[PDB]
RNA sequence: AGACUAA
């Protein structure tokens, strides 16, 4: 047993079995992080298990280390520093990071226990990593935990929380007002206000900023700066994009929640390609999430969730669902194995069992378009599927007429390496490369061959 | 669009 705050003495021993995969679903802020994954983790040094511990973003890591204090845990992650000689047993790294270390070599040791937080996320290196933990502890290899208060089968946006949530359904602006939202402005404590983008998260940001407030923003680029700012009294707006989805301990009393993102989708109608759909109502486990950054402290008893429209649970569409098995086709056991999607997450889209493996040199070139060239699993796999090495840029150029890339209603033009001048015209259309200005800029980048 | 940045 144990006192509210403290981890407990007592853990069940059948939870390091190998063979056995538990799944521990708790409400939203009910200790899994501060009391939860220390016993466990206090109890497998004690068992000597080769042990991981999963995050799906930096926001659950740095919320993981300061639970975890004190405990040797090689951090894998730049969102943590500690002390480590390479003698831990135990790893703590991001879902994507553990993903990418089975696509690389990059050897990856064996654990004989993984634990993984936030086992709902759908990031396809999240599905794909799930993929293999449910192979391993099926091998008998390993013994796995998969946390979360969302999983597989939620469907209930307003789940159990520590404190009573004031429910409000309310339009919610998508971008800078300057009348007719007093309420934003009139409330006297503290916001979360989740965006679906950075530009829209700068645009909502530096109109409350105009209005008299303080506002941080938090995405992936601003984290490292922001994030430790977060846990000061010194805000009134923290204006996130879903990296702060999960974890976050952020002291709020009001969280708003537009419920809507953009999505990629494969469409198959003529050449395949990949649009960005939407913006469409989020899932019923992310907006769940997000409601879960407040009514957090028994305390605080007046806490609200001010959201717009329903969720909207079928997501078979996603890009996500594909392209983790275009991760995972990919992914290998000591033995040789290639791993399953763990059970619920099977038969989203219909996928002919490994029919994306690469072989040899294609499988290299496929990690390296993802991690050196910045590019999506989809493009990615298309370019190295087709035999293209990573250097060699002219399927940049060779596309259809349809496939050249517009910026500002102008054809965009490329000044190669070698100093020729060609049309932005990919074989293979991606609009994650290309819709944002920001990604173009970039993707301009890898196609020069300055990347 | 968002997340990740190992070894």
């Not at 941080?216 to 700012?229: A, G, V």
């Not at 275009?326 to 997450?345: A, H, Q, V």
């Not at 033009?413 to 932005?424: H, Q, S």
């Given at each position: ?382 370019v190295a599927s087709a035999g293209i090495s990573y250097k060699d840029r002219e399927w940049c150029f060779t596309g259809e007429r349809n496939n050249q890339i517009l910026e500002e ?43």
């Amino acid at each position: 047993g144990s006192a509210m705050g403290e981890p407990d003495y007592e853990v069940d021993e059948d939870i390091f079995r190998k063979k056995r995969l538990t799944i521990m679903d708790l409400h939203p802020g009910a200790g899994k992080t501060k009391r939860i994954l220390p016993s466990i983790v206090r109890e497998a040094l004690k068992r000597r298990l080769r042990t991981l511990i999963l995050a799906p973003t930096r926001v659950v890591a740095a919320e993981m280390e300061e639970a975890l204090r004190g405990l040797p845990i090689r951090y894998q992650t730049p969102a943590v520093k500690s002390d480590h000689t390479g003698r831990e047993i135990v790893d703590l790294m991001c879902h994507a990071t553990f993903t990418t270390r089975l696509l690389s070599s990059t050897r990856v040791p064996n654990y004989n226990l993984i634990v993984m937080d936030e086992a709902h996320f759908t990031d396809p290196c999240s599905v794909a990593a799930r993929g293999y933990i449910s192979t391993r502890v099926e091998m008998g290899e390993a013994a796995a935990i998969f946390m979360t208060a969302t999983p597989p089968g939620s469907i209930d946006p307003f789940p159990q929380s520590n404190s009573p949530i004031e429910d409000i359904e309310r339009e919610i602006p998508e971008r800078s007002w300057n009348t007719g939202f007093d309420w934003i402005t009139d409330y006297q404590g503290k916001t979360v206000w989740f965006v679906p983008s950075i530009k829209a998260g700068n645009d909502i940001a530096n109109c409350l900023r105009k209005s008299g407030k303080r506002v941080i923003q938090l995405s992936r680029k601003t984290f490292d700066t922001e994030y430790p700012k977060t846990k000061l009294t010194d805000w009134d707006f923290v204006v996130t994009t879903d990296i702060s989805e999960m974890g976050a301990n952020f002291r709020a009393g009001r969280v708003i929640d537009p419920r809507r993102c953009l999505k990629p989708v494969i469409l198959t109608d003529g050449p395949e390609r990949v649009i960005l759909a939407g913006p469409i109502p989020v899932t019923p486990a992310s907006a769940a999430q997000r409601r879960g950054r407040i009514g957090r402290n028994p305390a605080q008893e007046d806490d609200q969730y001010v959201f717009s429209g329903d969720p909207l649970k079928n997501d078979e569409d996603h890009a996500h669902w594909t392209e983790a098995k275009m991760l995972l086709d990919n992914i290998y056991t000591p033995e040789g194995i290639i791993p399953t999607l763990f059970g619920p997450e099977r038969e989203k889209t219909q996928a002919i069992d490994g029919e994306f493996r690469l072989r040899g040199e294609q499988r290299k070139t496929f990690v390296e378009l993802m991690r050196r060239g910045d590019l999506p699993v989809w493009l990615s796999y298309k370019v190295a599927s087709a035999g293209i090495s990573y250097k060699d840029r002219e399927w940049c150029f060779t596309g259809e007429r349809n496939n050249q890339i517009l910026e500002e209603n102008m054809e965009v033009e490329i000044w190669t390496r070698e100093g020729e001048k060609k049309k932005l015209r990919p074989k293979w259309l991606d609009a994650r490369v290309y819709a944002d200005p920001m990604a173009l800029k970039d993707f301009k980048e890898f196609a020069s061959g300055r990347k």
